[PDB]
Write a protein that binds this ligand. Sequence first.
Ligand SMILES: *[C@@H]1O[C@H](CO)[C@@H](O)[C@H](O)[C@H]1O[C@H]1C[C@](C)(N)[C@H](O)[C@H](C)O1
Ligand code: CL
Length: 7
Amino acid sequence: XXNXXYX
Ligand SMILES: *[C@@H]1O[C@H](CO)[C@@H](O)[C@H](O)[C@H]1O[C@H]1C[C@](C)(N)[C@H](O)[C@H](C)O1
Ligand SMILES: [Cl-]
């Protein structure tokens, strides 16, 4: 991924 979250 690379982005983060949290969803
Ligand atoms: C998400 O990124 C932050 C900042 O770099 C780290 O401090 C954190 O430890 C990291 O969270 C981990 C734990 C989690 C949420 N279970 C996932 O595995 C993520 C990808 O990594
Ligand atoms: Cl991500």
